[PDB]
Amino acid sequence: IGTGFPFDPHYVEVLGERMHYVDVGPRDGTPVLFLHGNPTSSYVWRNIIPHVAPTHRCIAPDLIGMGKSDKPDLGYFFDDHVRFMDAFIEALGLEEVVLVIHDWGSALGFHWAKRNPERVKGIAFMEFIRPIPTWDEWPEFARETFQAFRTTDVGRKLIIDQNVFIEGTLPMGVVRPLTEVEMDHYREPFLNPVDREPLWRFPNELPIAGEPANIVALVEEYMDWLHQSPVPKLLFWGTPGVLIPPAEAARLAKSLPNCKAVDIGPGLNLLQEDNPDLIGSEIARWLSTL
Ligand SMILES: *CCCCCCOCCOCCNC(=O)c1ccc(C2=C3C=C/C(=N\C)C=C3[Si](C)(C)c3cc(N)ccc32)c(C)c1
């Protein structure tokens, strides 16, 4: 599994800030937009994109405050990411797109798709954000820590002061051990504690047990849309999984229209790090059917 990131940096000015993005593949045709989550960057797509770039434009931005993008003085609420991602898509002149999305990137992608369905030609997704109505429906192995993350005292001490979301949560979202080189890539945007606000606000935005109500409502809305939409859907899932355990993938396979579910084998949250070969190859095959 490759550890390098051989993509030329590109920057675009968005709402007075610079946003870094990967942009490879042809110039014409429908682009494929890859959206990462927490605490990753476009680095998480590094071994997926090379399967698609031979025949389709691949665009992979770093969310504001993450990766190589600028780090303004913000709270880094989901609403902040929505505003910047909306402007990013406009700044690039994108019309129709195919989405490939993960974790908070899937919240952004599904929310954009719900608001602009005529422009979405397909969605490939994995380990995505859905409403978690109670803590009992959150995976047991992650309950105590995410409950502590969602406080302003201990949660900030863990995530901001001790960088626990990078040194702990990230590696336990991958089945295989991440190498020192790979960890250093993920650590790079957050070496300074003063830059770690996105890592704490994101888990505090997760729609769990009715809080925050605004996020619960928006996620419920895009899940209702997805259940009614004829858009082609490609769902990757693994075992044991984290956000999408095998039982939930099964429920989704049955209920979502026009959906193919693909079992990647062993996987937790960062499925791209455990089976990039299958994920990239399957996306490349699926795009020809859209
Ligand atoms: C959309 C966002 C959702 C992403 C899904 C989450 O992906 C991760 C998968 O779920 C992980 C479940 N993990 C936990 O609940 C958890 C247990 C322990 C710790 C933690 C670790 C973990 C690993 C590690 N290296 C092997 C080191 C630590 Si430390 C820094 C010693 C630690 C200290 C304290 N006080 C608490 C917890 C840990 C974590 C972070 C998560």
Ligand SMILES: [Cl-]
């Ligand atoms: Cl999170």
